[model samples]
Target: MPEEEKAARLLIEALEKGDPELMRKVISPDTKMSVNGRLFTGDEVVEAVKEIQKRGIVIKLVSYEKAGNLWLFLVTVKNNGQEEKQAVAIVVRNGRIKEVIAMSI
Candidate 1:
């Protein structure tokens, strides 16, 4: 697979499984992150992912696209039995993801 595709797949898999350590590997130390309009640092994002796991949130990737250093993924997140579609954008540099931003649609 292409590098961008690999990155996108890895990101979705990590998010779906709520693996903080795996996420750390994919995310840069200086990562800028946001979820649902809330801004967070890289550490904060990792912590938040863990918390979401504790609450039994699961995100399933529906599609992914890459343009230059930016990758956009469409996903559906389920909590309890409710599912909502969300768009996540990841910016990668030097073969590692540098930032993530998410929005609901």
Candidate 2:
């Protein structure tokens, strides 16, 4: 698979499995992150992903498209039995993800 695709896939997989260590590998040390309308640092994002497990949140990729260094993804987020579609944008640079933005759809 392409580097961009691989990185984005790992990101979603990390969130789904609540793996902060794995997430650290994919994101840059200073990666800028946004969830819904809130902003986050890389460390905060990792910690938030870890916290998601407590709420039993699962992220599943539905589709993705690569546009230059940015990747756009359609994903399903499930909590308990409720599921919602979310749009995610991930930017890859120098083999590390530089930014991630996830928003409701």
Candidate 3:
């Protein structure tokens, strides 16, 4: 696979594992994440992942598509036995994410 494709998969894996440290490595310092219309900074994104774990929420990557510098994916999450799916976009630059946005579908 191409390096960019590998990077995108790695980023998705980080999210699946809810590894904040791994997420940090994939995300740029200036990264912004928006989940369900709520925007979060890079640090906040890290914290949010941790918080989700604490709240017993689990996220799984369904699929991904790369267009230019962006990696868009379908993510399925489970919280308290309730499952939900969302469309996610991860904007990458220099092997790191510049932004992540999640929308309900």
> What is the TM-score of each predicted model, taking all chains together?
0.90, 0.91, 0.89
Q: Which candidate tops lDDT? A: 2
Off by over 4 Å in 1: none
Q: Which candidate achieves the best TM-score against the true structure? A: 2
Q: Worst ten-residue run, lDDT, model 1?
A: 1-10
Question: What is residue 34's positional error in candidate 2, in angstroms?
Answer: 0.8
- Sort by TM-score, best first: what order? 2, 1, 3
Q: What are the clash counts of all predictions, listed in order?
A: 0, 0, 0
Q: Candidate 2 at residue 81, lDDT?
A: 92
lDDT of each: 0.83, 0.85, 0.82
The digit string of per-residue lDDT tens for model 1 on 49-97 reads 7887899998888988878998888999899888899999999776578
Report the lDDT tens digits of candidate 2 across residue range 1-105.
877667777887887789998799898769988889799897998898888887788888898888789889898999889989999998898568988899998
